[PDB]
């Protein structure tokens, strides 16, 4: 009695390949037969914690600066907040080198050109809905939800201040800043860039940077 | 046949099923390693060639050792490639292909040492002799 | 063969002194469970030597060797 023969030596212990491989061959046979700009928001109203004048410190240097001194210093204004920033990013083989292409954060929204308006991906809110009047996606009833419910918003406030009732009802990310501990600012802004990057890469990666 | 036709994704799916069914067919490991090289997954391929050699051959199969050398070369591991090709040449010293590949790896090593100014005198003198 | 394997398992569990049931089970196990076949032939050998007090048949020794 012999159990291993010329036929059984070639066979698998229990798996059948025919169904899987013929499907693969059918796919191959079918082939042989031949069968971008993104956007983000900020508040223009001058009582806001982030302003058109200190914005580039908060977002570029990841450094909080009271606007008090910025106007007291006589600081001059940009037409809008668009950065061509350097940040060295690691290749899938691990070597880091920086590359950037237009991002626009909102500072003077109604001057915006027809090409750009509907680009919002993430959004810095002040609170009152009048901040968005005339913005596209604003619902004709005056409701801004088509922006905030589909887009990851941001709102910059002091840690101590009781959250704004519109913002708390709205789909907006709160950022808590200290009055006196300047060192705690950097991780907050890092969290901002983290969340913004998550959003851009998951939902607006096809937009160009 | 699918791999030879260049349909490496489909061929991978076939060989992956065969390896799932049996661990004892040497050619299934070689075919998978070849696909890993073609998909530029050199780190995995090198490991499959080394484990294939240790598991199925009681002697150094020069064709498999050459495939390992090829993977190490594409991986940029020129030092390991040199040593692997020398291991193959020790078994089959009359094979001109092994001699050619050794000469090529030696030239690449010398080219690298001579291209980078960080290389010291002992290194550069060795590179000159290798060239 | 799988049915036979099941029946002989029940037979050997109910009557572990039946040498023939152990040998028949061993012959079935040779195809898929070498350790099971060895255990079956070993049990038959043990029963033959300790209880039948008869020498081991050459066929069993050959199969155990294989």
């Amino acid at each position: 009695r012999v159990w291993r023969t010329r036929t059984t030596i070639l066979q698998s212990t229990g798996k059948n390949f025919s169904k899987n491989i013929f499907a693969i061959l059918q796919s191959v046979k079918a082939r042989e037969e031949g069968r971008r700009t993104p956007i983000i928001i900020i508040p223009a109203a001058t009582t806001s914690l982030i302003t058109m004048l200190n914005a580039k410190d908060l977002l570029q240097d990841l450094k909080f600066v009271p606007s008090d001194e910025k106007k007291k210093q006589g600081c001059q204004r940009e037409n809008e907040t668009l950065i061509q920033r350097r940040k060295d990013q690691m290749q899938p083989g691990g070597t880091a080198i920086s590359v950037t292409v237009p991002y626009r954060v909102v500072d003077q929204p109604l001057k915006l050109m027809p090409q750009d308006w509907d680009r919002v991906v993430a959004v810095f809110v002040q609170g009152p809905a009048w901040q968005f009047k005339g913005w596209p996606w604003l619902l004709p009833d005056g409701s801004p939800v088509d922006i905030f419910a589909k887009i990851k918003a941001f709102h910059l406030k002091y840690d101590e201040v009781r959250l704004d009732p519109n913002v708390q009802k709205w789909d907006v990310t709160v950022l808590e800043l200290s009055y006196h501990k300047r060192h705690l600012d950097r991780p907050v802004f890092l969290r901002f860039w983290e969340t913004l990057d998550r959003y851009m890469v998951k939902h607006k990666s096809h937009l160009r940077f | 046949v699918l791999a030879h036709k260049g349909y490496f994704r489909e061929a991978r799916d076939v060989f992956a099923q065969v390896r799932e069914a049996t661990a004892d067919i040497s050619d299934v490991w070689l075919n998978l390693a070849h696909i890993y090289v073609e998909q530029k997954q050199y780190i995995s391929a090198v490991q499959m060639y080394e484990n294939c050699l240790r598991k199925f051959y009681k002697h150094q199969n020069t064709e498999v050792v050459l495939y390992l050398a090829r993977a190490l070369f594409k991986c940029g591991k020129l030092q390991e490639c040199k040593q692997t090709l020398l291991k193959a040449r020790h078994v089959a010293p009359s094979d001109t292909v092994l001699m050619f590949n050794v000469a090529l790896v030696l030239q690449r090593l010398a080219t690298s040492v001579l291209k980078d100014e960080k290389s010291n005198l002992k290194e550069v003198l060795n590179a000159v002799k290798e060239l | 063969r799988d049915i036979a394997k099941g029946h002989l398992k029940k037979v050997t569990e109910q009557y572990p002194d039946d040498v023939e049931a152990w040998i028949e089970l061993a012959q079935i196990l040779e195809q898929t469970d070498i350790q099971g076949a060895l255990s079956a032939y070993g049990t038959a050998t043990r029963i033959l030597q300790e209880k039948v007090q008869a020498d081991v048949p050459p066929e069993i020794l050959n199969n155990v060797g294989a």
Binding site: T5, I9, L10 | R70, F73, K74, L104 | -
Partner: peptide, 27 residues
């Protein structure tokens, strides 16, 4: 353009059949 000289190695996808099994015979 001159193709950068690679390692001279022909990749062969093999399907070598196993040797015929002359296993010990059961009686």
């Amino acid at each position: 353009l001159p193709e950068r000289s690679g390692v001279v190695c022909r990749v062969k996808y093999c399907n070598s059949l196993p040797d015929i099994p002359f296993d010990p015979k059961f009686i």
